[PDB]
Structure formats: structure tokens, C-alpha cells
Amino acid sequence: TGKAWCCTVLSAFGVVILSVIAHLFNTNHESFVGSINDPEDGPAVAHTVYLAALVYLVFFVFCGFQVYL
Amino acid sequence: DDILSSIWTEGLLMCLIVSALLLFILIVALSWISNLDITYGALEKSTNPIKK
Amino acid sequence: SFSHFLYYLVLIVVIVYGLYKLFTGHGSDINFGKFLLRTSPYMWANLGIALCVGLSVVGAAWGIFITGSSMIGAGVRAPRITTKNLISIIFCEVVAIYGLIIAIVFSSKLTVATAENMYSKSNLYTGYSLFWAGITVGASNLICGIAVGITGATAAISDAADSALFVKILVIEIFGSILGLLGLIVGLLMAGKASEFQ
């Protein structure tokens, strides 16, 4: 029902937005670590964003079985 | 001593007559909002077994 | 009342303060001259540019709810009038366009001036003229915006009774819009001579 579509679509794009974000701190993209206020260490961040992105893949598959039934 | 004064400098007055103008308009506007009163009759339910 | 009690008291402090500085031999210390020579001429000009568009736009929007709120009333039994009585909404708006033009004319004159040639003759005239040009054009159009709205609700009614009354009343509402055009003229003759800041 509607209570699962919320966490489904949210977790769906959440995986797709966070995965691209992690790939950019790793590669040291200018817009994300080029300035001084931005964090200095890239891969110290991408290791944190993979993990958080998995958490949304948990709720995408978990509530993905519930809407199926 | 060609200045206006020591307490009441020209830069203090420019920073106060502007505050009055910006505070007078605020006093006006709040009166326009304070005088709001809800139209209570159209919300309550009224019934008379004389007319109905 | 309280708000009326202050006005009697502000008069009294100014009179005690006006005498204590006088019977002691300090009357020249309250010198409005230095308050006009030493204050920055940019303050007087940026008020006449905001009050001109400020007090004019209050005029237009005032005359619109006096006009529209009655047109909508008569148009519950005679809804044909909404397109014929629209004119009175135009004469309420045009005064705003009179103000929006002056603010752009005077914004051309705001420039940067040196520190030595700041408080000179040609720069104090400019500020004092751009100020009382903004008050005149912003007060005239503030009132034209009210005498047109009032006159615009009587025609919005008489049109609903019999249509023959409408055109006979615009001769009043057209003589109401002249007033907003006369300040627009006089406001420029002031600032026709004033040259931008050096």
C-alpha cells in the first residue's frame, strides 16, 4: 500500500544519488573538495557513503517484497 | 569645536530617524491586522423551526 | 487616550529642552544648519527614490479594493459589468507607473563622489531636490489613488442600475487622474537642473 511506496521510491533514488556522490569524493572532483570549506580527505568520505547507501537498498528489497504481495 | 556635539553626532541621528520611519510603518501595519475579526455567523450551524 | 497622551508629552520635553538651552546661553547649539551640512547627501536622495515608488504604490493598491470589492458586489445580480467597469482599475494603476518612471530617472543621477568634493554646493542641492521631489510625487499620487477608487465604486453601482449613468461619471474620475499627472510634472522641474554627484 501507500505506506511502502514512500520508503520504496525514496530509497530507490537515495541509492542512485548517494552512489554518484561517493564516486566523486573518491575521484576528488573540484566542486566537492576543491574549496577549503569542503572536507580534505575524499576516500575517507566515500567509505561512509557506500554503507549508508546500502541501508536504502535494504528497505528497497524489504518493502519490495511487501508490495509484491 | 566645529562639530555638532559629542553625544548627538550626525551619524547617530541618521541611524535614528531612519529607525523611527521603519518603526512607525510597523505600528501602522499591526493595527491593520489587529482589527481582523472572523465572520462567525457563516461557520456556526443555525436552525429555526419557524421558517424551515 | 494613551497614544494621544504621548503627543502632549513630546511637546513638553521639547519646550523644557528648548528653554534650558536658552536661558543658560546655549541656543546656538541646537543648530539645524550643521544637521543639513554634515549629513550625507546620499541619505536624502535614496529616500525620495523609495518613497516615490513607496507612497505611490500604496495609492494604487488602496484604490483597487475600494473599487474591486464593490464591482464584485454588484456583479452578483448583474455580472455583465466586470468588463465595462474595468477602466477604473487602469486609472488606479497608472499612477504607479508614474512613480516607477521617476525612480528610474533619479537612479541615473546616483554616482560616486570624492571625499573632498562631497559636501559642496552642487551635491547638497541635488540631494535636497531629489528628496522633496520624491515626497511631492509620492503624496500626490497617493491621494489620486484614493479619489479615483471612491469615484470608481459609484460608477460600478450606477452601471448596475442603468447603464446610461456610467459615461457621465468618468468626467469626474478623469478629473481625478489629472492630479497624479501634475506632480509628475512639478517633480521633474525640481530635478531638471540638478546634476549627478561629482
Place this chain on the structure above:
Amino acid sequence: MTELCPVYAPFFGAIGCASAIIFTSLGAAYGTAKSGVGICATCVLRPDLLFKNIVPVIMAGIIAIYGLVVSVLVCYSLGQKQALYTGFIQLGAGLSVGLSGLAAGFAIGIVGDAGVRGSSQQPRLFVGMILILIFAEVLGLYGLIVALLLNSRATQDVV
């Protein structure tokens, strides 16, 4: 410290920032409440005219966005060592849109409340409410025009 950069000039900037988002927020409340009483009274009998009578709430909720704009242009133009010229230019920007968006916030409220009360009795009267509601919303903008032309002259050859 210098005759062209006193230390009391940025007062006129901050006060110009607040004066633009405050007055519009008051104008957009009277314009939102005076209408909200109407909608919630006409739709006691005629609930089909609900999502068509939300229009006066939108036009008033937009006046604030004309102020938020001006509160952000001057905010990035502020600094400790800025001239007295730049100060009063940040003033006349906030005092105009704050003062034009204030009245237009009131007119939108009154006309909005009457129209929604009218269309319940004459549904042909809803378009006349719009066109009479157009010429008031535009007045929130003519002050926004002047706010910009002034702020473009902020840092032109300043020292």
C-alpha cells in the same frame, strides 16, 4: 576610520535586509488570513469550489518571495569595510519592496475574500476576480524592479 568608510554604515544594510522580508511577511499574512476566512465559509455549502478558490492564497504567498530575493542580494554585498554610499543603496532597496509588497498584500486579501463569496452566488464572477487580482499582484513587482537598479550601482568604482 576613514571619511568614506565609517563604522556605522553596515547598519543600513542589515536593516534593509530585515525590512524587506518582514513587511512582506506581514502583507502576506493579512492577505492569507482575510481570504482563509472566506474559503472556509463558502465551502461549508459548496465544497466543489475549493481547489478553484485557493488562488488568492497563492498570489499573496508569492509577495514574500519578492522579498526573500532582495534579502539575499544585499547579504552577499555586505562587508565590514564598505562605504557609506553602498549603505543607503542597500536601504532604498529594502524600503521599496518592503513597502510596495505591504499594500499589495492587503489588497489581495480584501478582494480575494469578496470574490470567493461572490462566485458561490454567481459562478460567472470568478474570472472578474482574477483580472482585478492581477493589477494588485504586479504592484509587488514594481518595487522589486527599483531594488535591482539601485543594487547594481553598489560597487561601481567605489573606494
Place this chain on the structure above:
Amino acid sequence: MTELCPVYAPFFGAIGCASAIIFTSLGAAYGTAKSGVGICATCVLRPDLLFKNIVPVIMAGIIAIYGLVVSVLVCYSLGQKQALYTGFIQLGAGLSVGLSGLAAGFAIGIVGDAGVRGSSQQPRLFVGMILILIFAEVLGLYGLIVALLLNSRATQDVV
């Protein structure tokens, strides 16, 4: 001690820190009091709608929290030795959320007191009441935005 950092600078820091929560508390207090009358007049007959008309009371409590945030962020920028620039930035950062949450308070009380009653004779009206509040709640959110852009610029590029 210094021209750019006088001793009467923090005066404009504590007046700004206080005004952030004072005026939002008055705007929240108008929202709970005014709306609190309509709730207590309908629900004596139809208390089925008792835990459903509390939403206007919630959206008032949101306003005060927009001020508590700002009183804290300035309180950790205060110092005995600070620029007078920094003082003024803290002033408009308190008013802009203060006198814009004071406006959103009126918009909620005038509506909540009305829409809860109309909702008692027309349950379809409860939807439209929500949107009319949300376009008013967001008026206070615009003040929170401006202050944070000001309070960020209070300590950088100063001496």
C-alpha cells in the same frame, strides 16, 4: 579600545538574541490561544475530531523553534571584543525570523479558529484548511533562511 571594535557593540547582540524568541513566542501564543477556542467549542459535541484538530497548535510550536535555533547560534558568536559590524549582523538575524514568525502566528489563529468549525459541518473542508496553513507556515521559514545567511557572514572576513 579599538575604533572598529568599540565597547557598546554587544548591545546589538543580546537585543538580537532575545528578539529571536520573544516575537516568535508571541506569534506562537496567538496561534495556540486563538485556535484553542474553536477546538474547545466544537469538540464538546463532536469529540471524535479531538486528536485531528490539534494541527494548528502544532504549526505554532514550529514557529518558536525557528527562534530558539537562532538565539543559540548567535549566543556562540558573542564576545567581549568583537567588531560592531558583527553586532549589526546579529540584529537583523533576530528580527527577520522574529517579526516574520509573529506574522505567521496571526495567519494560523485566524484560520484555525475558522476551519475547525467549518470542518464540523463539512468534513471535506479539512483538506483545504491544511494548505491555507502551509502557505502561512512557510512565511516564517523564509525568515530562518535569511538569518542563517547573515549569521554565517558575521565572523568571516573580520578583525
Place this chain on the structure above:
Amino acid sequence: MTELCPVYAPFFGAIGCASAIIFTSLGAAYGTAKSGVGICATCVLRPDLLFKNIVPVIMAGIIAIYGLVVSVLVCYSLGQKQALYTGFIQLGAGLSVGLSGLAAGFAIGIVGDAGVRGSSQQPRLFVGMILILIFAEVLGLYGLIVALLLNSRATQDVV
């Protein structure tokens, strides 16, 4: 005496210590009076509900103590010689609780005057009433917290 320690700094400490309890008691009276009427004219026919309708009078009796625990902390920091920063900050802690606790007194009276009169007719409203008052008592608490964060910074890093 000294540049950073003038003789007219303790003036603001007295007003900060005095205004705190004053502006709360003006709230704890208006909130104790409007409730005192609605109770003594409601408990004439249903006096079984006396001890449970005292709750507004208790909450309004709490607002005065938020104004007392600020005046004691301030009062044990005053001295003939202290910085202006020690004085202006104590003013902020007298207004924040004073003028916030005042609003919470404006609300609890207007609520309790009406919520009690409904409680006599419907016992299912009593749990709904107190939910509202908690949103009114908390506005008197956000003014308390700010008065602590300010007084903590009032003597540390001071000369």
C-alpha cells in the same frame, strides 16, 4: 573607572534581575485570573471537578519560578566593577524569560477560560485540553534556556 569597566554597567544588571520576575508575574496573574473566573463559575453546578480544573492555575504558577531562578543567578554575579559585556548580557536574560513567559500567561488564561467550560459538559475533552497547555507552557521554557546560555557566557573570558 576603566574603558571596559565603566560605572554605569551595573545599571543593566538591576534591570535584568528585576524585569525577569516582573514580566512573568504579569503573565502569571492574567493566566491566574481568567482561569479563576471560568473555574468559579463552572464549579457551581459540578463541584466534583474542582481539584482537576486547578491545572491552569498550577501552570501559571510555574511561569513565575522561571523568572525567579534567573534573578538569583544574575544577583550572584553583580559587582561595583564589571565589564559592559557582563551587564548587557544580563539584560538579555531578563527579557527572554520575561517577555516569553508573558505570552504563555496570555495563552493559558484564554484557553483555560474556555476549555474548563467544555470539560464540565464533556469529560473526553480534559485530556485534550492539557495537550494544548503543554504547547503553551513550553514557550515559557524556550525563554528559560536562552537565559542560561547567556549567563554562562557572562563572566568567562572577561576582564
Place this chain on the structure above:
Amino acid sequence: MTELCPVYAPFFGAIGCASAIIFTSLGAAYGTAKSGVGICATCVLRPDLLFKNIVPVIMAGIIAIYGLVVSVLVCYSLGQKQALYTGFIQLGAGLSVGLSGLAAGFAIGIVGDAGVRGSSQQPRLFVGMILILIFAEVLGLYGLIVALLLNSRATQDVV
């Protein structure tokens, strides 16, 4: 110029000469006005009493004559070089008659309007009103009696 004879002394003489006739002439208007309306009501039905009832109008006029004989005598005591003792006293002579004669006008107007309406229904009452309108007039006379002693003293033993 001189200590005892400076340039701002005659400014008090002009105000004293003008005040005396202004405040009286205001009092005489409030007298003739209210009493005139009384005359223009009963004489619709009893024109016989027209000339009897023009006594209040005459006592009102007398108050303005007192405001003249002060201004006359005060004009012929001025000069470009006089002392403050000569200038302050003329303010004392101008305010006594002015504000005493004002009071004497506020009574006659309130009594005449009632006494003419009572004299239309009882002829004996005519002499009673007149006895009252002596005392009200004498209050305007006491002010004159003080002014003369002042103006005879203003240049008495003066440098």
C-alpha cells in the same frame, strides 16, 4: 547683547499680547454658540423672550474686551532693548486673563442653554440665572485684576 537686556526678551512680550486676546476670543465663541442655540429654540414658540435672553451673549462679549485692554497696554511697553523681568511678566499678564476668561466662557455657555429653556416654562427663573452668570463672569474679572498689578510692576525699578 547685555546680560539683563538680551535679544530674546521681546519674544515673551508678543506671546503675552497675543495670548490674552486669543484665549478670551475662544471663550466668547463657546459662550455665544451654545447660548445662541438655546435662543434659537425657545424663540420659535415664544419670541416675546427674545430680547430678555441676549444677556449671555453680552457677558460672553465682555470677556473679549478684557483680552483687549491687556493687549493695548502691553503694546505700548515694548522696545527692542528691554529686560527679561519686563518680558516674563507680560507672559504672566497674558496667560492669567486668557485662561481665566476661557473658564468664564465655559460656564456661561453651559448655563445659558439650560436657563433659557427653563425660563420659557417659568418666568420667575430669569433672575436666578442672571445671579449665577455674575459669578461665572467674575472669574474672568479676577484675571484682569492680577494682570494690571503685573503690568504696573513690569517696568517698576528696572535697569
Place this chain on the structure above:
Amino acid sequence: MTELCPVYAPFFGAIGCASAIIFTSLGAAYGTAKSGVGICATCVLRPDLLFKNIVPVIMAGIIAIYGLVVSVLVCYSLGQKQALYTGFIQLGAGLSVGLSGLAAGFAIGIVGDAGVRGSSQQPRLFVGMILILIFAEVLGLYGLIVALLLNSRATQDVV
């Protein structure tokens, strides 16, 4: 430049010139306004008493001519170089005739409104109304006399 004759002296002579006009127009227009209603209301039943009940409008207009005489008369006594004494006196000239003619307005306008409503009924009243309209007019005439004696002294024995 001299101590007796500064450059800011004509500020007083000018204000004495307008104050004669300003405070007479308010007294002659007011008197012409309230008499302009009684004439119109009565003459519906009796439009034959039209050209005879326009005595009040005349006696009010005579007030303005007093305000016009003095202003023309002092305007020839003004100069780039004049004494304070010549300025302070001209101020007393304007106020005296100014605020006395203003009294005539609040009497003639009161009496023209009533005596004309009664004169429609009892034609013997038309000789009663006029005498009251004379004493009201004499008050305006005493203010002239004071100004004409003042203005003979303005340029009498002055440096």
C-alpha cells in the same frame, strides 16, 4: 550678522504672514460649510428665503479679508536685513487675528445652522440670529486691532 539682526530673523516674519491666512480660512470655510447645509435643507420647503438667509456666509467671508489685510501689510515690512524685534512682533500679529477669526468659525457655523432652521418657521427670528452673528463677528474684529498696533511698532525705533 550683527547680534541684534541675525540672518535667521525673517523665519518669524514669514510665519507671521501665513498664520494670518491659515487660521482664517479654517474659520471662514468652517462657518461657510455648516451654514451651507442649513440654508439648503430649509429652502426645500421655503425657497423664497434663499437670497435673505445668506447673511452667515457673508459674515464668515469677512474673516478671511482680515487675514488678507495683515499679510499684505507685513509683507512690505520684510527685509533681508531686519531685527529679531521686527520679526517677533510680526508673529504676534498673525496669530492674534489668526486664532481669533478661527473662533468666529466655531460660532457662526454653529449659529447659522440653527437660527436658519428656526427662521423658516418664525420670521421674527431673523432679527435675533443676526445680533448673535455680530458678537461672533466682533471677536474677529478685535484681533485685527491688536495686529495693527503691533505693526505700527515693528518699524518704530528699530536698528
Place this chain on the structure above:
Amino acid sequence: SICDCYGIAQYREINAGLPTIVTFPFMFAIMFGDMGHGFLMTLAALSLVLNEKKINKMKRGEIFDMAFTGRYIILLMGVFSMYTGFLYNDIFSKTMTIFKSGWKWPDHWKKGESITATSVGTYPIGLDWAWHGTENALLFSNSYKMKLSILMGFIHMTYSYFFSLANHLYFNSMIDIIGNFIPGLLFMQGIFGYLSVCIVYKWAVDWVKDGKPAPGLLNMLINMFLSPGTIDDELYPHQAKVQVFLLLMALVCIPWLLLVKPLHFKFTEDFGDIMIHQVIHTIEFCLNCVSHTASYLRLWALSLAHAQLSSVLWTMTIQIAFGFRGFVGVFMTVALFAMWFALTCAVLVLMEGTSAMLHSLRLHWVESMSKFFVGEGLPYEPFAFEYKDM
């Protein structure tokens, strides 16, 4: 269904519903203007459309019917919002770095030291990505997006104005071509057509290389009315020669719009009716050529607002989490995201959608359609049957 609500069109005139298919959702793109949000609008329109046969049969609410009735309106607004944001170079307040930047930085600098760029070439498609994060960015976009909306308002109006010509040629009414059409053509094209063409000339001229100062355009438009024949900075040869003629052209088009059509009637009581209505056609139309052109500058601000809400909402929520680490860092990223995704999907898509949805409607009914639209039509409601909801 939109153009009908304002007025029923006259028999056999232009339907304004064909240009309204594209101008309406494209103006939404100018304001809404972001690839990230516009992508979301498309999907909810790509769902309602595909399943339209299921949705047709089942019952619906009322908020949900309007979405299904306009499922094709929302599709375009999401598509064209992705083409704009590629030119504005915005995606969730971030930029795209595909092509080379025609700008360039120095070879060496230090921390806290200010720097300025060197131009190399031109960036082909869009706003060059070197402006992001910069100090003087808004001095470029503001002076850009203004000149966009002016030109985009000068084009939409005149295109709507030649529909007048293609109607008088149908009903064979040639007097209005010489009476009504042409005088308004010569009025505003001689003012704002001169304003629109000069703006393009100022951009294709390297004023730095020639050594000449770039003239201002506000002083150029003002002095040509007040102090004609005078200039402060030159734009092109014989400038003052053209201005005085364009001004002379406008003043003659007012009375020629005012007299020729009534006189044609008298020449062949009623004349009083034909004149006064023609007096009002002038006092309105001349202002409507002005207060409409300013009213297109709402395309400017709502574009300026949508950035400063997006670029704040990114900076206050998610950029916080990138400073934390550990499992405490894994939690703040996950909680603050759903608050970013929520406000994004409620504040910037719906509200700013609706506020921007109505201004595009406004620009058609009032600024564009007022040129040619007469109205006063009779509907076509024929006689046929259906089922009653009862």
C-alpha cells in the same frame, strides 16, 4: 480547457490553444529551471499516462482528477525543465563539467589570496562551469537573465500580435489594418524593438579592444525622450539621428490610432459611441505595451529564487554530514537526506510548481492574448445523451 475559461472565441478566429501547448510549459521551465526537479515531475507524469486505461475506469478523488486531466501538461513541464537546467547548468544546486571551460586560472597562488581568471575561448552550450562558487556570479546571471526575459517577452507578444493581421485578412476588414494594427506596430517596435536590437549589438562588440567605453542602455532610453539629440556614450554611427525619428514616429501614431477609424464611420449619437471606445483602446494599449513588458520580469526572480532555496537547502542539511564520520556519521547522512528529499519533493516541486504554474497562465490571458482576443462567442453544446450520476 484553459483558454476556454477566460473567454469563448469569436466564430472563425484564431484559436490560442495551439501556441499554448508549448509557450505555457516552456515558461515554467525558465522559472523552475533545474534538471533535478524537472526529472521528478516527468516520472509522476510518466506513470499517470502509461496506466491511463486502468485509471479511467476506477473512481477518483478531486485533487487526483485534475492531475489525470492534465497528465500531458505535466509531462512537458518536466521535459523542458531538463533542457533549461542544462543551459543554466544546475542539478540539485550542483553543476556539470562536461565540456572545456573557456576561462582559465593563473599558474600559481596561495591560500586566502584573491585571484581572477583569463579568457581563452567560448563555452559552447550553456553557462560555463567556472562561475559556480565564485564571488561575482550573481553580477552575471542577474545581468543575463534580465536581458533574456526582455527579448523573450518582445518575441512572444509580437507573434501574438500578427494573429490580428491574419484575422482582418479573413473577415476582409482593411480599415483596422490601417486604423488599429499598424499604429501599434510602429509605436512599440520603435521603442522596444530598438531596445531589443541594441542589446544584441552590445554583446557582439569587443568594447575593450577598440578602447571605447560600453554605453549604458538605461541612460540611452531615457535621454532620447528627455534630452533628445544628446548622448553620453556612443553605440553606433548616427545614433541620435535615429532616436529623434523613432520618437517622432511614436507621437504621430497616437492620433492616427485615435481619429482615422471614427472618421471612416462619419464619412462612410452612434459616433459618440465609436469615438469613446476608440479613445479607451489607446489609453489602454499604449500602457499595455509598457506594463506588460515589465511584467515578464517575473521570469527573472522566480528563477533567481529557485536557486537560493535549492543552494541553501543543500548547504544546511547534507553538507553538514560530510564533516562527520563513524556510525554516528552513517546516521546523520541517512536522516538528513530524507529531510532533504522531503522538502525537495514538497516545497520546491509543488509550491514553486503552483506559484510558477499560475504566472505562466497569467502571461497568456493578460499579456499575450489581450492583443488579438475579442471574445463574446456562443458555445456549441449539441443535443445528445449520457448517464446521470444521480
Place this chain on the structure above:
Amino acid sequence: MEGVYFNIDNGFIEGVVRGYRNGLLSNNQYINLTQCDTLEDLKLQLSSTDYGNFLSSVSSESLTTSLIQEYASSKLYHEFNYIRDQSSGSTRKFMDYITYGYMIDNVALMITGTIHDRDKGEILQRCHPLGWFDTLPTLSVATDLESLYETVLVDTPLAPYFKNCFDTAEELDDMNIEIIRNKLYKAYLEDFYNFVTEEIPEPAKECMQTLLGFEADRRSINIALNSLQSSDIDPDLKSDLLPNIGKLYPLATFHLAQAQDFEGVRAALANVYEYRGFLETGNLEDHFYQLEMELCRDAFTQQFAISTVWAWMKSKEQEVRNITWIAECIAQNQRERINNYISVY
């Protein structure tokens, strides 16, 4: 000035009322009624005017003169409760004092039913609907006044008006009710006169201070006349029934209480030209209704005032009094006094 702060809240009320008046029947529209044969041609006629299809739910046989008067006033009250439900603030009170006069009629109409022992259902149909309150039918309980006062009438806003009424006997009768009913208009017309004096702005103030000077003169005179049918009434009692606002106050009020014949009354009214020759000629009540239009006809000449609402009703009740007067003449085939109807518009 007049119309500057009016349209803020009271503007949409001004346009609707002045739309409802153009639907009033002019002299020409009355004549077409005068020559109608029956009540069925009448229905055909009034549909042309603003009354419209106001009898579509009615048959041809059911047409009577009472069913008309009932279905002409039902259209007036939905047009009054509409304007009353759309109002706010001071305009609400002004539209609430008008109801305080139509409920006092219902007070003296329920109490007489208790004297005569009639059923409330038969009575409440005769009660006026604008003068309703929730505790109304509870007045059918008892005969005493203190009984009916404390039980019912203290809650209503008629509390301050019975100060001069607690001299009643333990037995209450009809001639005592008319003395009770008339002491309330003495106070009502004063509390509604001090209200207009204070909170209503100009120019409605000058207009309503006149219309109350009339409604008090209509009652100050008719008390002196009905007292002649009776044997005797003390003069001191009569001065407690006369209002204190009108032109007759104070001078002529003295001689109306003390006039024991029809001739001594005309000596009291001879000293005011507004009420001079009404007694000398013709049907008295038709002279008042003629001056009532002429004071309401001058209120519509104004604009930006909330005195039109009062005039709108009083100008539309005389309309309905002319429909029925003519409705009886046509139905009964007496076509003699069919032209006595009053009209100004």
C-alpha cells in the same frame, strides 16, 4: 472621511444591498398588478420582476392571500440572514439590535397564549423567525413575570430592559402586557441610540439619529390615543412609557401624557411642523408610512454608510404590505381601494 476605511470589511455588503433594491417595484410595476383578474394572472405577472418563480411548488387551487404574504417574507429573511452571516464586528451588532425588536413581539405573543390556554404548535407558526432564541418556547410555562424572568429571560440580551417592569400583580392579564411591551421600546430605542452615537461612524450617524427620532414619535403619540379608549390613566404612569430621543422630547412629551381628549393632543403636536397635520386629515397610519419612505429614500442617496440595511428592510416591508392589500382586493372583487398602495421608487 466617508468611504476610505469602509470597504475594508463592509464593502461587499454595500454592493449586494444596492443590487437588491433595483429589484424594488416602481409605480409602473404596481399598476400591472392592479388590473389583474385573479391570483393566477398575478403569478404570471410577478415572475417578470425580481420575485421570479417563487410559486413553482404551488398549485392553482392553493392560491390564497395568506400563502402569498408568507412566501414573500420568507424571501426577505434568506436575504437578511445572508447579509448577517457575511458580516463582522460593529456591523454584526447593528444587525443584532434589529433582531432585538422582532423578538419582543414574540415575547408578548407567547405570554398571551398562556392567558388564553392555547397550544404552542398553533402559536409558534405565528411567531416571527428573526426574533428567535433557544429558550423561547419555555415562556409557555407560567403566568407570573418573575417566574418567566429568572427562568428564561435573564440569559437573553433583554436582561437590562426590565428594570421598570417588576411592579406586576400576581395575576397577569392582557391590558398589563401592552404596558410591559411598551416599556421595552422605551429602553431599546435608547440603548440602540447611545450605540449609534458612539461606535457607528459618520454619515450613518446623522441618518440613524433621525430614523430613531421617527420610530419614537410614532409610538409616543399612539400611546396618548389608545389611552382615550380606556377610562383613565395617571399622567405619571404615561411618562414611563414614552421614549426620550425624539423631536417631541422634552417639550411636547409633557402635554401628551396630560392630554385627555383628541383636541388637546393636536395642541401638543401643533408646535412641531414635522407632525402638524397628520391628525387633521385622512388615515393616520398612511401618513406615517409616507414619511417613512421619505426618510429611507434620502438614505439611499448617501453612499458608504451602513444605514442602507435598515432602510432596505423598512422599504421592503411596505412593499409586502402593498402586495397583500392589493391581493385581497383582486381576490374579493372589491376594486375600490386597490390604489391606496404606497410607493416612491
Place this chain on the structure above:
Amino acid sequence: SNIYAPLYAPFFGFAGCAAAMVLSCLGAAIGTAKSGIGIAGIGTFKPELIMKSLIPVVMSGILAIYGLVVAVLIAGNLSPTEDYTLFNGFMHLSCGLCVGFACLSSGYAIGMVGDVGVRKYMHQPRLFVGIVLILIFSEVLGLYGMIVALILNTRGSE
């Protein structure tokens, strides 16, 4: 240099060119507004007597011409190169206040007369002459203000 010509003198020369128009335009509006209310008040009863009763509004309209004439003369005597005395600055101030509060008073009487005078003209058409005769006495007050404002400006220059 010169003491009789300070630099803050033009501040008082525009307050006469400003107070003249703003107060006169306030008098030109009240007269037209109230008169316009009394004319349309009868327009539903007697449409004939309207075009004959547009006499008040022009008598109000003339008031703007009084303040317009004064101000235009003042702007013809100001310049940033002229030596503008302080005497002349105070005369110009009173030039704009004399005509101001006088053309404002005239605008108040004409609004209280034309309102009643028209609404009681549908009853008696012999009343017209008295209505016009009274408004003449209410306009000359506006004249008497500019008779002085021309004599003041003459003397400040010379």
C-alpha cells in the same frame, strides 16, 4: 564666503514647491470625491440633473491650478549656480503654506456643500442659484492664498 547665502538654503525652497502641490492636490480631491458621491447618489433617481451639477468638481479642479502656478514660478528661481539667500528660502516656504491650507479649506467646504446641495436639488429646481452663489464664497479663499504667494516671491528676488 557669503553669510547671507549659506548652502542649506535650497532645503527651504523646495518645501514650498512641495507643500504647495501636496496640500492643494488634497483639496482638489476631497471636493471631487464627496461631490462625486452626491451626484451618483441621485443618478438612480433623476438622471437629468447630473450634467448641470458638474460645477463643483471643476471648482475643485481649479485648486490644483493655484498650487501649480506657484510651484512653477519657484522652480524658475532655483539653480546650483545662483546665490540663493536664506531670506528667499523662508518666503518660498510661506508661499507654499499660504496657498496650501487655503486651497485645502476651500476643498473642504465645497465637499460639504455640493453633497447636500445636489441631493436636495432633485426636489426643488429653483435652488440652483443659491448653491452656485455659496460655492463662489468658498473658492475665493483659494484665490486669497495665491494673491499673497505672488507678492512674496516678487520680494525675495527684489
